[PDB]
Amino acid sequence: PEAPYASLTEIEHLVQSVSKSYRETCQLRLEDLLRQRSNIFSREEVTGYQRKSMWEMWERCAHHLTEAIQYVVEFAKRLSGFMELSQNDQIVLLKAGAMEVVLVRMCRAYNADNRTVFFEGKYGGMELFRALGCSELISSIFDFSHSLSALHFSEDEIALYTALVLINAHRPGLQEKRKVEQLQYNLELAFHHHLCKTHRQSILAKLPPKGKLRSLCSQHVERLQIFQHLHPIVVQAAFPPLYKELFS
Numbered sequence: 001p002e003a004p005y006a007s008l009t010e011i012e013h014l015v016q017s018v019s020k021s022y023r024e025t026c027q028l029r030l031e032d033l034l035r036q037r038s039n040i041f042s043r044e045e046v047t048g049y050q051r052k053s054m055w056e057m058w059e060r061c062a063h064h065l066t067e068a069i070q071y072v073v074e075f076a077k078r079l080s081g082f083m084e085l086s087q088n089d090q091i092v093l094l095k096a097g098a099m100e101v102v103l104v105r106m107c108r109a110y111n112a113d114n115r116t117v118f119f120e121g122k123y124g125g126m127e128l129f130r131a132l133g134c135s136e137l138i139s140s141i142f143d144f145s146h147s148l149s150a151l152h153f154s155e156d157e158i159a160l161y162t163a164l165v166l167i168n169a170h171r172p173g174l175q176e177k178r179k180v181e182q183l184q185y186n187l188e189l190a191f192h193h194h195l196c197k198t199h200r201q202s203i204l205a206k207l208p209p210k211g212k213l214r215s216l217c218s219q220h221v222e223r224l225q226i227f228q229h230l231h232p233i234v235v236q237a238a239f240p241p242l243y244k245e246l247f248s
């Protein structure tokens with residue numbers, strides 16, 4: 001619901017529901033990502049990626065980001081109250097928030113011991129993506145993933161945190177702002193309750209500064225839009241109203 005006086009029953013069910021929605025919309029399960037860390041690209045395979053053209057790497061990365069976004073839209077549609085919002089407000093929250101959630105989820109695929117990331121079956125450093133010529137942007141994404149990875153999120157924590165990244169009533173363009181404030185309030189209450197119950201409140205002060213995630217996503221989507229205008233990826237749109245806002 002979106003109602004006031006949210007009981008302990010509603011709060012604890014909000015936690016379990018959001019956590020269920022999170023794991024059922026993850027392309028890769030956490031145990032498979034952790035188990036694949038020892039599977040690292042050799043020097044000849046990394047050279048194979050570096051000798052691919054700008055457009056071949058752009059096509060690979062863009063198609064995987066398209067899937068990551070589609071999974072996040074499924075996650076958002078499972079959050080209680082979200083599908084009851086207008087199509088305008090759903091699209092306003094997803095346009096800003098969807099890629100911000102993808103950027104947070106990336107910390108699961110980041111290994112801080114050797115600074116590598118999961119990409120197409122194995123782990124590799126940022127040198128793997130040299131043909132794209134986005135070493136400054138990609139270095140920022142590696143840094144943000146490193147800082148989040150040092151928090152050691154549980155599955156409940158990263159699920160609630162990404163739910164609050166989406167359910168934000170301060171996105172410009174919301175026509176039912178009050179209603180999104182009520183959903184955000186209850187998710188904050190469940191997040192703070194869960195952190196307090198599990199003695200994990202110390203992560204609150206370590207969360208990325210408010211504005212850092214929006215700024216990084218802004219630089220990231222700007223670059224993707226520039227790449228899409230020079231070499232358009234053909235997408236079979238799963239959510240055509242949202243697609244229309246980002247592509248046409």
Ligand SMILES: Cc1c(CN2CCN(C(=O)C3CCCC3)[C@@H](C)C2)cc(F)cc1NS(=O)(=O)c1ccc(F)cc1
Nearest residue numbers: 061064065068106107109110117118119129134145223
């Ligand atoms: C692959 C990966 C990166 C590096 N990526 C460089 C290329 N890129 C660009 O956006 C480029 C920069 C502008 C042009 C494209 C992003 C995909 C980030 C960082 C990270 F923290 C996790 C992952 N693994 S992951 O498993 O989380 C994952 C794999 C593939 C995905 F698509 C999404 C996540």
Ligand SMILES: O=C(O)c1ccc(-c2nn(C(=O)c3c(Cl)cccc3C(F)(F)F)c3cccc(F)c23)c(F)c1
Nearest residue numbers: 007008009010011012013192193194195196197198199
């Ligand atoms: O074994 C312990 O040491 C222990 C101590 C406290 C809590 C605890 N219960 N709690 C409730 O809201 C609550 C209450 Cl008051 C009645 C029935 C059931 C609950 C439940 F946890 F299920 F919500 C909390 C809220 C915030 C922070 C907390 F730490 C708790 C706990 F679950 C275990």
Ligand SMILES: O=C(O)c1ccc(-c2nn(C(=O)c3c(Cl)cccc3C(F)(F)F)c3cccc(F)c23)c(F)c1
Nearest residue numbers: 062065066069098099224225228237238239242243246
């Ligand atoms: O209906 C669909 O299936 C669908 C799939 C992905 C998006 C999507 N793409 N996207 C990109 O930045 C992106 C990606 Cl991931 C790859 C190549 C080109 C782009 C471009 F930059 F052009 F939008 C987004 C950024 C924020 C919020 C989004 F919802 C998206 C979309 F809007 C709809």
